[PDB]
Amino acid sequence: IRGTLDRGASFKPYSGTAYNSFAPKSAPNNTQFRQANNGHPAQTIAQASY
């Protein structure tokens, strides 16, 4: 037999992740949130490591 198969989107042949697996499951990326609204536009939280 020969043909095409589609395991669907529910197919995950492994545990954990394959994207920043060492990154703390709480540590966020470079996000630029907002300061509890009011009159404070934008707000940066990151790091300059070059």
Partner: protein, 50 residues
């Protein structure tokens, strides 16, 4: 600064602090967790294929 087609395939939100108003400071508190491993394939000895 830049915008990205950020997404998450093998991960979901384990702890979602705020529903809406998420992108605010109190939102970064959200945590992630890997999706349960799900293997998919042809049964043993191809039972049921015939």
């Amino acid at each position: 600064t830049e915008e990205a087609d950020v997404l998450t395939p093998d991960t979901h939100l384990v702890h979602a602090v705020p529903a809406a108003d998420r992108a605010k400071v109190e939102g970064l508190s959200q945590h992630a967790a890997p999706n349960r491993p799900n293997f998919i394939g042809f049964r043993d000895c191809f039972v049921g294929l015939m």
